[PDB]
Amino acid sequence: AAKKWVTVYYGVPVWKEATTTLFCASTEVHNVWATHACVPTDPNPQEIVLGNVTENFNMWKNNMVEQMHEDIISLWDQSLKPCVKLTPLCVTLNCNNVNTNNSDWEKMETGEMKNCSFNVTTSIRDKIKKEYALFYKLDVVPLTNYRLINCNTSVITQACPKVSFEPIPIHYCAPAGFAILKCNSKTFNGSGPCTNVSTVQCTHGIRPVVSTQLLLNGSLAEEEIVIRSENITDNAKTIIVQLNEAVEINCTRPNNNTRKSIHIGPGRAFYATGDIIGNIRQAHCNISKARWNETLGQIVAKLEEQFPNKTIIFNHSSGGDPEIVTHSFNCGGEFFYCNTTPLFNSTWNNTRTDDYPTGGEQNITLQCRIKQIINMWQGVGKAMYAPPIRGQIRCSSNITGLLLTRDGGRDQNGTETFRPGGGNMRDNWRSELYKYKVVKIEPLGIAPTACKRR
Amino acid sequence: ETGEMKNCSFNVTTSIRDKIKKEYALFYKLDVVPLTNYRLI
Amino acid sequence: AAGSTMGAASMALTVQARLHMLQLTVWGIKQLQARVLAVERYLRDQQLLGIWGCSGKIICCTNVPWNDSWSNKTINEIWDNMTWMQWEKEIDNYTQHIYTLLEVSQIQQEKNEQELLELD
Amino acid sequence: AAGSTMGAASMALTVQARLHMLQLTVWGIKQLQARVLAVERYLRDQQLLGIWGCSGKIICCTNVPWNDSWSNKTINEIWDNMTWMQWEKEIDNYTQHIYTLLEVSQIQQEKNEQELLELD
Amino acid sequence: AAGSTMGAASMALTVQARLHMLQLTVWGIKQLQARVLAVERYLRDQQLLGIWGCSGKIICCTNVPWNDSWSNKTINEIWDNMTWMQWEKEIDNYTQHIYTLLEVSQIQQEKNEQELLELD
Ligand SMILES: *[C@@H]1O[C@H](CO)[C@@H](O[C@@H]2O[C@H](CO)[C@@H](O[C@@H]3O[C@H](CO)[C@@H](O)[C@H](O[C@H]4O[C@H](CO)[C@@H](O)[C@H](O)[C@@H]4O)[C@@H]3O)[C@H](O)[C@H]2NC(C)=O)[C@H](O)[C@H]1NC(C)=O
Ligand SMILES: *[C@@H]1O[C@H](CO)[C@@H](O[C@@H]2O[C@H](CO)[C@@H](O[C@@H]3O[C@H](CO)[C@@H](O)[C@H](O)[C@@H]3O)[C@H](O)[C@H]2NC(C)=O)[C@H](O)[C@H]1NC(C)=O
Ligand SMILES: *[C@@H]1O[C@H](CO)[C@@H](O[C@@H]2O[C@H](CO)[C@@H](O)[C@H](O)[C@H]2NC(C)=O)[C@H](O)[C@H]1NC(C)=O
Ligand SMILES: *[C@@H]1O[C@H](CO)[C@@H](O[C@@H]2O[C@H](CO)[C@@H](O)[C@H](O)[C@H]2NC(C)=O)[C@H](O)[C@H]1NC(C)=O
Ligand SMILES: *[C@@H]1O[C@H](CO)[C@@H](O[C@@H]2O[C@H](CO)[C@@H](O)[C@H](O)[C@H]2NC(C)=O)[C@H](O)[C@H]1NC(C)=O
Ligand SMILES: *[C@@H]1O[C@H](CO)[C@@H](O[C@@H]2O[C@H](CO)[C@@H](O)[C@H](O)[C@H]2NC(C)=O)[C@H](O)[C@H]1NC(C)=O
Ligand SMILES: *[C@@H]1O[C@H](CO)[C@@H](O[C@@H]2O[C@H](CO)[C@@H](O)[C@H](O)[C@H]2NC(C)=O)[C@H](O)[C@H]1NC(C)=O
Ligand SMILES: *[C@@H]1O[C@H](CO)[C@@H](O[C@@H]2O[C@H](CO)[C@@H](O)[C@H](O)[C@H]2NC(C)=O)[C@H](O)[C@H]1NC(C)=O
Ligand SMILES: *[C@@H]1O[C@H](CO)[C@@H](O[C@@H]2O[C@H](CO)[C@@H](O)[C@H](O)[C@H]2NC(C)=O)[C@H](O)[C@H]1NC(C)=O
Ligand SMILES: *[C@@H]1O[C@H](CO)[C@@H](O[C@@H]2O[C@H](CO)[C@@H](O)[C@H](O)[C@H]2NC(C)=O)[C@H](O)[C@H]1NC(C)=O
Ligand SMILES: *[C@@H]1O[C@H](CO)[C@@H](O[C@@H]2O[C@H](CO)[C@@H](O)[C@H](O)[C@H]2NC(C)=O)[C@H](O)[C@H]1NC(C)=O
Ligand SMILES: *[C@@H]1O[C@H](CO)[C@@H](O[C@@H]2O[C@H](CO)[C@@H](O)[C@H](O)[C@H]2NC(C)=O)[C@H](O)[C@H]1NC(C)=O
Ligand SMILES: *[C@@H]1O[C@H](CO)[C@@H](O[C@@H]2O[C@H](CO)[C@@H](O)[C@H](O)[C@H]2NC(C)=O)[C@H](O)[C@H]1NC(C)=O
Ligand SMILES: *[C@@H]1O[C@H](CO)[C@@H](O)[C@H](O)[C@H]1NC(C)=O
Ligand SMILES: *[C@@H]1O[C@H](CO)[C@@H](O)[C@H](O)[C@H]1NC(C)=O
Ligand SMILES: *[C@@H]1O[C@H](CO)[C@@H](O)[C@H](O)[C@H]1NC(C)=O
Ligand SMILES: *[C@@H]1O[C@H](CO)[C@@H](O)[C@H](O)[C@H]1NC(C)=O
Ligand SMILES: *[C@@H]1O[C@H](CO)[C@@H](O)[C@H](O)[C@H]1NC(C)=O
Ligand SMILES: *[C@@H]1O[C@H](CO)[C@@H](O)[C@H](O)[C@H]1NC(C)=O
Ligand SMILES: *[C@@H]1O[C@H](CO)[C@@H](O)[C@H](O)[C@H]1NC(C)=O
Ligand SMILES: *[C@@H]1O[C@H](CO)[C@@H](O)[C@H](O)[C@H]1NC(C)=O
Ligand SMILES: *[C@@H]1O[C@H](CO)[C@@H](O)[C@H](O)[C@H]1NC(C)=O
Ligand SMILES: *[C@@H]1O[C@H](CO)[C@@H](O)[C@H](O)[C@H]1NC(C)=O
Ligand SMILES: *[C@@H]1O[C@H](CO)[C@@H](O)[C@H](O)[C@H]1NC(C)=O
Ligand SMILES: *[C@@H]1O[C@H](CO)[C@@H](O)[C@H](O)[C@H]1NC(C)=O
Ligand SMILES: *[C@@H]1O[C@H](CO)[C@@H](O)[C@H](O)[C@H]1NC(C)=O
Ligand SMILES: *[C@@H]1O[C@H](CO)[C@@H](O)[C@H](O)[C@H]1NC(C)=O
Ligand SMILES: *[C@@H]1O[C@H](CO)[C@@H](O)[C@H](O)[C@H]1NC(C)=O
Ligand SMILES: *[C@@H]1O[C@H](CO)[C@@H](O)[C@H](O)[C@H]1NC(C)=O
Ligand SMILES: *[C@@H]1O[C@H](CO)[C@@H](O)[C@H](O)[C@H]1NC(C)=O
């Protein structure tokens, strides 16, 4: 009764998966992660809910994670570029110990904080002065003569002492013509089909937190703990456990550490640790025992379903360099490395935690060490020297999740062993961006009609 | 070859600024000039 | 119901319509690329609509018949009872054929015939 | 007198219509930003006119009534006896209301009704 | 034959219609400039056509007479029996005169007269 004609519709609601460049959106502290170059966010970032649609998400193949990884590295670097390189400090250090014997149990130092003297060229090139500084054991190596760790083979750059590293939430925004889809399903688990899909121009803000073993200040699970993995059976993959409740962790570096300024060139000032006023103590972190016990009881129930009948064993890290085999976080520029042996202390039957005897202990303590020479991403980017920050440093954070790996999974005794392992920092960011996918919009479409043009 | 590929020793500051080591390398004649003392061209 | 007929799931809507110094910083370079790209994508669609004579249209009507080799389903099988994403997949292989037909003769002849008619 | 009626001071005219390697130098970066920005501003206006069906117009006529809550003055009180800058201030709070009305139904319905009429 | 009449050598056709991270590298900067420039050139032509009311046209018809001082040759001497490049050279000195006439009155008056006619 009619012929069909080709008509063009513009504003057609279709899309295809695509990877593009995202931009960021968000006091004179020069925050490195959230610079003044960020655009402001939309006060009313209205979310659009899709109808009966399905989409396939895969957090393990998500290019947003990879793009973030590169952005964090580029922001770390660059920010540290216009600063003192400390090459002149790579000289023989003549070191000795300090007297820590000034009842501070769980807080005592034992043979660390070495007193080193050195010969450094002053701001005037033909004049050499003897200078003194205290170093953390983990920052020096013996040749007693010492050298700064990692001087050979790398350049350690001092952060400019005005710049903050505090994480500030960063929102990722698609360019116009693109959109970010998110999976809101309670059943999503980081992979496969999702039926509750909505879209935004920008993601929620993500704090660019860097840590090892424990994920800090990320999002909590909406209701129940979710265990995510690319593969449960493959022991080589990281298992990300997202908590539905936070666990408080409180860390203290209880020393009156007063810094010293040393001129090692023409406007190049090195900030030394100076000395300690009062009784020197090691750093430590506390968590609530009751919270840890509840958290682990719920985690074992969940791991037990994945690995039924078998004994759940938690263990400490496998051993190695205390840069990557310990817990790590940053509070105000002080880099903490902490012993988590007490957190992954034991094993148990059923889903009943055990071997944490009832007693007056309320606070589980983790002994910590401080390093000034650090290597984020190991071989990627440059070594950095953290200035001391004047003493009495306290901070606290929200444990939002754990990174676990399986210890081979070759135990023939009906057990499974989990350790606070993990890989590259990509794992941390993957755990937060897991719900997002980037697509491109193709608004021009074609359909048959019954109209005809004059 | 006829009188090229010189064996040169030199005193170079090592990765540690207060330590100097003697090192050896061979150079093409066209890469060095005399001042027997030589310098890189 | 033109935007409601082609599946209930037409809710992507038009997020693309919703959408300081140029410092070349780590975030700044990315911001520049985002702006340049948004312009390029906008213009690619606008230019194509311009070519077909659909520059000012939301829905434009043409003089090119449906052909039916692309899809032999009828209006109530394609227009109704279908979601736009499914539809674009169903005729994806004819995209260039159709675009070519939308320009060739359809705009080119239509305009040359008008040039002749306007001489009277 | 369309450009003369709305105040004697209509003399801003169209300076905006009047308007080598890309080296990223101190002046060069600023030159790049200026070019990118000029494009973005042009397109924001052109896109909005396109949405309303006013893409090829200097002055476009619409099917949306004045409402009169925005301003209850008459043609010879608003159009005449007034300067454009004063006028834009007088109805500044209705900018989004009016823009919404210029698109919603006015372009959307007009085009869907035409789609139906063109089926005959 | 509109594209064939103005010389056999009309074969430049429309190569201009045929036409990853923004890293600021030696080749990358040049790639950026190429994209920005392509946009600027496109818009300069599109804006001018928009001004004349020829935004959706391949060939647009106007209400401005030929004048004949620019060239006093006839249709079969100019339109036919001539190549476009020769022609653009022949009337090159009248480019601004003609462009001015294509806008002034031709679009401006035409639209103001329509504004008055549309009040009825
Ligand atoms: C997880 O989130 C928590 C907060 O929810 C976060 O803890 C916060 O860390 C910031 C780090 O900057 C603390 O801010 C400091 O607070 C002290 C309090 O006296 C200030 O003195 C500090 O001042 C510094 O910056 C100034 C800028 O001009 C300098 O002038 C000055 O000299 C110092 O350099 C700074 O404001 C904040 O107080 C805590 N919050 C709490 C409640 O303690 C935690 O770090 C996040 N976790 C992780 C792993 O990042
Ligand atoms: C982190 O955890 C440690 C370990 O529990 C906390 O140290 C403990 O602090 C309590 C409270 O002061 C001490 O208990 C009692 O203190 C009173 C104070 O007068 C004293 O009179 C009692 O005899 C008893 O000591 C507890 O002994 C002490 N533990 C140790 C090993 O000394 C620490 O305060 C926690 N705080 C932070 C900020 O992390
Ligand atoms: C590290 O060594 C330096 C010198 O070896 C110590 O500084 C000395 O402190 C005493 C205290 O009375 C002064 O009298 C000396 O004159 C200081 N010497 C210099 C060169 O300034 C410093 O206190 C030591 N640090 C520790 C923790 O032992
Ligand atoms: C800093 O320089 C001083 C000399 O200016 C070094 O001290 C001398 O070291 C030599 C090594 O054999 C001794 O023979 C001299 O007797 C020392 N002089 C004095 C006054 O003690 C010092 O060792 C250098 N320090 C470092 C860390 O290189
Ligand atoms: C299906 O999707 C809708 C939209 O994504 C979800 O609606 C949310 O419901 C919670 C309930 O309190 C609200 O707080 C949120 O604000 C709603 N989202 C929005 C965008 O308004 C709905 O809950 C999802 N259903 C399931 C089973 O997850
Ligand atoms: C995470 O979700 C995915 C998707 O539902 C699960 O993968 C499914 O696993 C079942 C097990 O029999 C298979 O039959 C399905 O075919 C798998 N789906 C897909 C799309 O491959 C995955 O196992 C879930 N993870 C956990 C820990 O349950
Ligand atoms: C860590 O968890 C605590 C609660 O367990 C968070 O405290 C809440 O923060 C929100 C922020 O608006 C407040 O509205 C609540 O009232 C706070 N709760 C309580 C009990 O006061 C804390 O903000 C979390 N920290 C991080 C970094 O997320
Ligand atoms: C998840 O990891 C497991 C462990 O590697 C994969 O299962 C293995 O698949 C290989 C294929 O040749 C077999 O030879 C092994 O014997 C399997 N192992 C076990 C324990 O059965 C599994 O296929 C992976 N899942 C996915 C979706 O790739
Ligand atoms: C970390 O410090 C916070 C506060 O700095 C502790 O939170 C307090 O806990 C007591 C327990 O009764 C509450 O009464 C307070 O109201 C809490 N304060 C706030 C601000 O919420 C927290 O318990 C400490 N955690 C650990 C592990 O020491
Ligand atoms: C936790 O890990 C440690 C370290 O691997 C386990 O201790 C090892 O146990 C094997 C068993 O034959 C011994 O051969 C190793 O020599 C032990 N290592 C050390 C350093 O002593 C420990 O058993 C694990 N925990 C559990 C519950 O299995
Ligand atoms: C973490 O702390 C534990 C102790 O809390 C350290 O392990 C102890 O090492 C000593 C060394 O002689 C042994 O005598 C103890 O029996 C060990 N205790 C346990 C529980 O194994 C552990 O080495 C520390 N780890 C790190 C990374 O610092
Ligand atoms: C890890 O296990 C050890 C024992 O294997 C726990 O050590 C006991 O801790 C309580 C706490 O006050 C002491 O009273 C006992 O005397 C300790 N026993 C021994 C043998 O030293 C340790 O606390 C466990 N870690 C955690 C977090 O509970
Ligand atoms: C466990 O840790 C908490 C938090 O560190 C301790 O709470 C302290 O309680 C005293 C009571 O007067 C307060 O003055 C302190 O200010 C609290 N600490 C903080 C950081 O606010 C608690 O006492 C510890 N419990 C045990 C048994 O050691
Ligand atoms: C989902 O499909 C049902 C089918 O009856 C429909 O009623 C519903 O409206 C669809 N969802 C949306 C968002 O329209
Ligand atoms: C750097 O010096 C330390 C000093 O012992 C040495 O152990 C390390 O192997 C050196 N690095 C390399 C690559 O040789
Ligand atoms: C640290 O030393 C400074 C020196 O003035 C002093 O004012 C401050 O109170 C000291 N802090 C502590 C915790 O003793
Ligand atoms: C738990 O206890 C029961 C008691 O009969 C025992 O049979 C079972 O093997 C134990 N399981 C583990 C994981 O030790
Ligand atoms: C951990 O929680 C379980 C729950 O029943 C409790 O029985 C057990 O005693 C708790 N352990 C500790 C150390 O609080
Ligand atoms: C569609 O167009 C092509 C162009 O060659 C033609 O061959 C084909 O027969 C047409 N299809 C139908 C069903 O008419
Ligand atoms: C379109 O043609 C194919 C050819 O096999 C046929 O199978 C299909 O059913 C036809 N569809 C319609 C709607 O007629
Ligand atoms: C849509 O097509 C299916 C094909 O099985 C048919 O069963 C259904 O009734 C159709 N729906 C409408 C609204 O015609
Ligand atoms: C042709 O279109 C059909 C429509 O379903 C599609 O399935 C097929 O893969 C397409 N073939 C090619 C080569 O694009
Ligand atoms: C203007 O439009 C609004 C839309 O709600 C309406 O409520 C209002 O009454 C209208 N004003 C007049 C004066 O009609
Ligand atoms: C518009 O309405 C307001 C309401 O108070 C009134 O005061 C004002 O005089 C009216 N203006 C005109 C032009 O009627
Ligand atoms: C403009 O409005 C004022 C208001 O007082 C009036 O006095 C004046 O005469 C009006 N001008 C014209 C041209 O109507
Ligand atoms: C509303 O418009 C009037 C017009 O003069 C203006 O004075 C007033 O400030 C505006 N209010 C808001 C909230 O913009
Ligand atoms: C062309 O236009 C100009 C405008 O001043 C006019 O002077 C001239 O006479 C016109 N030429 C012809 C041949 O009419
Ligand atoms: C145009 O006018 C010039 C004036 O000299 C004349 O020489 C020329 O032949 C004329 N051309 C035509 C086509 O009449
Ligand atoms: C083109 O102009 C030349 C001028 O000499 C003339 O000889 C030739 O015949 C003309 N060609 C046509 C097709 O009129
Ligand atoms: C004017 O146009 C003629 C056309 O051939 C050209 O030869 C002459 O050079 C032009 N003069 C100027 C000043 O452009």
From TrEMBL, chain A:
Q: Which residues form the Human immunodeficiency virus 1 envelope glycoprotein Gp120 domain?
A: 4-454
- Entry's localization field: Host cell membrane; Host endosome membrane; Virion membrane
Q: Name one GO cellular component term.
A: host cell plasma membrane
Establish whether keyword Coiled coil is in the entry: yes
Query: Signal sequence: where?
Result: none
Q: How is it modified after translation?
A: Highly glycosylated by host. The high number of glycan on the protein is reffered to as 'glycan shield' because it contributes to hide protein sequence from adaptive immune system.
Spans annotated as CD4-binding loop: 317-327
Task: Spell out the disulfide connections.
Answer: 24-38, 83-160, 90-151, 95-116, 173-202, 183-194, 251-285, 331-395, 338-368
GO process terms (BP): clathrin-dependent endocytosis of virus by host cell; fusion of virus membrane with host endosome membrane; fusion of virus membrane with host plasma membrane; positive regulation of plasma membrane raft polarization; positive regulation of receptor clustering; symbiont-mediated perturbation of host defense response; viral protein processing; virion attachment to host cell
User: Which residue stretches belong to region V5?
Assistant: 411-421
Enumerate the UniProt keywords alphabetically. Answer: Apoptosis, Clathrin-mediated endocytosis of virus by host, Cleavage on pair of basic residues, Coiled coil, Disulfide bond, Fusion of virus membrane with host endosomal membrane, Fusion of virus membrane with host membrane, Glycoprotein, Host cell membrane, Host endosome, Host membrane, Host-virus interaction, Lipoprotein, Membrane, Palmitate, Signal, Transmembrane, Transmembrane helix, Viral attachment to host cell, Viral envelope protein, Viral immunoevasion, Viral penetration into host cytoplasm, Virion, Virus endocytosis by host, Virus entry into host cell
What's the protein's topology in the membrane? Peripheral membrane protein; Single-pass type I membrane protein
Q: GO MF annotations for this entry? A: structural molecule activity
Specify the domain of life of the species encoding this protein: Viruses
Zinc-finger keyword on record: no
Sugar-modified residues: 52, 119, 152, 189, 196, 231, 250, 256, 286, 290, 293, 309, 315, 339, 345, 349, 363, 398
State the family named in the UniProt similarity comment for this chain: Belongs to the HIV-1 env protein family.
Description of how the protein assembles with itself and partners:
The mature envelope protein (Env) consists of a homotrimer of non-covalently associated gp120-gp41 heterodimers. The resulting complex protrudes from the virus surface as a spike. There seems to be as few as 10 spikes on the average virion. Interacts with host CD4, CCR5 and CXCR4. Gp120 also interacts with the C-type lectins CD209/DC-SIGN and CLEC4M/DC-SIGNR (collectively referred to as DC-SIGN(R)). Gp120 and gp41 interact with GalCer. The mature envelope protein (Env) consists of a homotrimer of non-covalently associated gp120-gp41 heterodimers. The resulting complex protrudes from the virus surface as a spike. There seems to be as few as 10 spikes on the average virion. Surface protein gp120 interacts with host CD4, CCR5 and CXCR4. Gp120 also interacts with the C-type lectins CD209/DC-SIGN and CLEC4M/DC-SIGNR (collectively referred to as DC-SIGN(R)). Gp120 and gp41 interact with GalCer.
Q: What is the protein's given name?
A: Envelope glycoprotein gp160
Q: Which residues of the full protein are shown?
A: 29 to 508 of 860
TrEMBL record, chains C, D, E:
Q: What is the topology of this protein in the membrane according to its UniProt annotation?
A: Single-pass type I membrane protein
Residue ranges, annotated region (Immunosuppression):
30-48
Give the location in the cell: Virion membrane; Host cell membrane; Host endosome membrane
Coiled-coil-forming residues are: 89-120
Q: Can you tell me which residues are glycosylated?
A: 67, 72, 81, 93
Top-rank lineage group of the source organism: Viruses
- Protein name, entry field: Transmembrane protein gp41
Q: Which organism is it from?
A: Human immunodeficiency virus type 1
Portion of the full-length sequence here: 529 to 668 of 860
